[PDB]
């Protein structure tokens, strides 16, 4: 759960998610490449919540028939608007409640690689 | 001689003999088998080196239309040879069977061609202490070599001359209307030297012949059945 989800969808474009957001959701270009405004297909399931009681929408959507998990690229809220998938979030959440607060694992655990 | 019989403490010192080895005047030096592509098998000892040879690989009615007959002389195997003639063979270019390489114990292995030596080594030794079982479901995939491992080892019994068993079964197999009246008494669970005790249950009634007659320790219908085959599934489970 961290070996990228890039399944090769192509490279489309939307005027801030109003075009290739619903059309591409039907056929071709899923949740991989494709850039829009700046980010990409990350705009789909914005996991809100906060550093209060872990990302609700995150693990919540994963449990149901939504987030495929296994790191499918998703925007959380944790401590800042990131791109980390709910998969890695679990890891940081496991070591979090384990010892004490993600404050330590956050500055320790990497994200780039 | 095989290349996966030893163990550890004594490597090279403890191996085994080939299936198609030890024949004729073995009293002096070993002598393998070699086919001449024609109905005949010569035994010119191991020192053989006449017109190289070829291992059982791709045949076509005596004269394989391979064009590149996989040869193997001495050490390396110079591509091929192919005398390009309707002659017998390259003096002895034929292994007859791929069982001549590995030991009669290794050839038993089902798909013996997808693992390493060491890997297959341990498994080969497992057939030496597979502790017989009354069940013996016999492994699905099994070479037609075990057909003799049940009779040669005399694990089970035999049937002389004609048939007509009229078996009474129990602990003393009946007789056969072949020549005289001889009752075949089972080993009665007998006794083992490793604390196992093998038994031999029969399989007949009224009369029948061909020529198995009553199995042995870990066997089933003349089929060598050491362990037991059961549906399995590859996957991790909690860490068990």
């Amino acid at each position: 759960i961290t070996q990228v989800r890039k399944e090769k969808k192509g490279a489309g474009m939307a005027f801030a998610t109003p075009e290739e957001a619903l059309a591409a959701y039907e056929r071709g270009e899923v949740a991989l490449n494709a850039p829009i405004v700046v980010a990409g297909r990350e705009t789909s399931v914005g996991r809100l919540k906060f550093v209060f009681a872990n990302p609700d929408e995150a693990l919540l959507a994963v449990a149901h028939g939504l987030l495929d998990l296994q790191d499918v690229v998703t925007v959380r809220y944790l401590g800042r608007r990131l791109e980390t998938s709910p998969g890695r979030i679990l890891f940081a959440r496991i070591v979090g409640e384990a010892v004490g607060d993600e404050k330590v694992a956050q500055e320790l655990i990497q994200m780039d690689v | 001689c095989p290349v996966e019989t030893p163990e550890g403490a004594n490597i090279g010192l403890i191996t085994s003999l080939a299936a198609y080895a030890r024949v004729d005047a073995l009293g002096f030096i070993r002598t393998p088998y070699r086919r001449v592509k024609n109905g005949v098998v010569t035994e010119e000892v191991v020192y053989m080196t006449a017109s190289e040879e070829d291992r059982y690989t791709i045949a076509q009615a005596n004269t394989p239309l391979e064009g590149d007959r996989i040869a193997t002389d001495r050490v390396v195997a110079r591509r091929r040879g192919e005398p390009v003639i309707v002659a017998p063979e390259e003096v002895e270019f034929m292994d007859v069977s791929p069982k001549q390489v590995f030991s009669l114990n290794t050839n038993l292995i089902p798909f013996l061609e997808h693992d390493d030596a060491n890997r297959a080594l341990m498994g080969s030794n497992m057939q030496t202490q597979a502790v017989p079982l009354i069940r013996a479901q016999a492994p699905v995939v099994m070479t037609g070599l075990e057909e003799r491992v049940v009779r040669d080892s005399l694990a089970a019994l035999y049937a002389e001359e004609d048939g007509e068993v009229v078996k009474v079964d129990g602990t003393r197999i009946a007789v056969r209307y072949e020549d005289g009246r001889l009752v075949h008494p089972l080993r009665r669970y007998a006794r083992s030297n490793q604390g196992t005790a093998f038994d031999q249950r029969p399989r007949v009634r009224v009369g029948q012949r061909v020529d198995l007659l009553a199995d042995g320790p870990a066997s089933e219908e003349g089929f060598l059945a050491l362990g037991q085959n059961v549906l399995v599934a590859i996957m991790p489970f909690d860490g068990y």
Binding site: - | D169, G170, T171, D199, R201, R205
Partner: protein
């Protein structure tokens, strides 16, 4: 919706597909799995527990005049099943005086009511020219899997205790479809299917699980 249509097509002492239709996306397996769990577990079934040959002392032997052996006849008996048409029965001893050249099926035992044999034939043995297979066997109602630990007394001598497999239900599974009108094709469809009838009707098996499941669900009431 609300109240679903619980359908059941019992075949009569085997099979018996039970199907539910309207539910909620995320409950088709929430109710199904838990039940099957109970079936292949805590269920008052019946099976052999102790036997007693005749001229044979213990299992490690052989019965003269019989094609099979002690251990053999014992194993085949493990697959035999009997019903108790009376909740007042705790255990019924059975007798088997086989004769000569025959196969001695299952229906050749003691033709006593109170208990039936839903599994004819059952090659138990095949004695010929022996004329001796008198073997006493006890059978009691249990629950689960209990080996040879409850030393089946009775005879108190050579009553070699045989493994117990009281469990009536065996091998179970289910599926979840999706085509129960209502609204939104996101609904589920429970359709469990017991594939066994040890000694209890498929229907009973279900009610049993659901019932026992409640007794264990009531514990989650008053805390501490």
């Amino acid at each position: 919706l609300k109240a679903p249509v619980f359908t059941a097509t019992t075949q009569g002492d085997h099979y018996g597909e039970f199907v539910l239709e309207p539910l909620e996306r995320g409950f088709g397996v929430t109710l199904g799995n838990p039940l099957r769990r109970i079936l292949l577990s805590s269920i008052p079934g019946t099976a052999v527990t102790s036997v007693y040959i005749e001229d044979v002392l213990h299992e490690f032997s052989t019965i003269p005049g019989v094609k099979e052996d002690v251990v053999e006849i014992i194993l085949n008996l493990k697959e035999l099943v009997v019903r108790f048409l009376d909740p007042k029965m705790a255990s019924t001893t059975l007798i088997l005086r086989a004769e000569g050249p025959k196969e001695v099926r299952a229906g050749d035992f003691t033709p006593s009511a109170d208990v039936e044999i839903m599994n004819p034939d059952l090659h138990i043995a095949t004695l010929e020219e022996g004329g001796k297979l008198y073997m006493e066997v006890r059978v009691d109602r249990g629950v689960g899997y209990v080996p040879a630990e409850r030393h089946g007394i009775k005879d108190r001598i050579n009553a070699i205790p045989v493994d117990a497999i009281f469990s009536p239900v065996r091998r179970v599974a289910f599926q979840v479809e999706d085509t129960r009108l209502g609204q939104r094709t996101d609904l589920d469809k429970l359709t469990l299917r017991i594939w066994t009838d040890g000694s209890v009707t498929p229907l009973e098996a279900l009610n049993q699980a659901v019932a026992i499941l409640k007794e264990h669900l009531n514990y989650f009431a008053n805390p501490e």
